[PDB]
Amino acid sequence: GEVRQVSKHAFSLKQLDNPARIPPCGWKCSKCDMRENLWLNLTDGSILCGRRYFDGSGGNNHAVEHYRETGYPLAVKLGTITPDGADVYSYDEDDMVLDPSLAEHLSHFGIDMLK
């Protein structure tokens, strides 16, 4: 349906130790020159570009390629984080999802969504 369901990964997500401090702006894909359509993987804090859709819109597939190598399922679209939530995608469930632990998962990378 249209409503975003809770990811089965959200409660128990393992976030790796020694995370980067993710700034509030100015990000780049670590694999190419893209400065828009960037996805923060919530396990490892990688910042990588969104996929090429079958219409030829979107990025260079760096975040999806990283998922295929790591199995790390949850990513948040940088620039969509507000006090009211964010755009969160599950590669595993293949859907936009709700992460009830989003505030904690972002706080891991020094992101205060409330700000």
Ligand SMILES: O=C(O)CCC(=O)c1ccc(S(=O)(=O)N2CCC(c3ccc(F)c(F)c3)CC2)cc1
């Ligand atoms: O990228 C990544 O690596 C991570 C994010 C990701 O894989 C992903 C996949 C599917 C969706 S979606 O199902 O919500 N939807 C898919 C069609 C999109 C679209 C594109 C162009 C349009 F012109 C349009 F009208 C719609 C809008 C978004 C959202 C995100």
Ligand SMILES: [Zn+2]
């Ligand atoms: Zn890229």
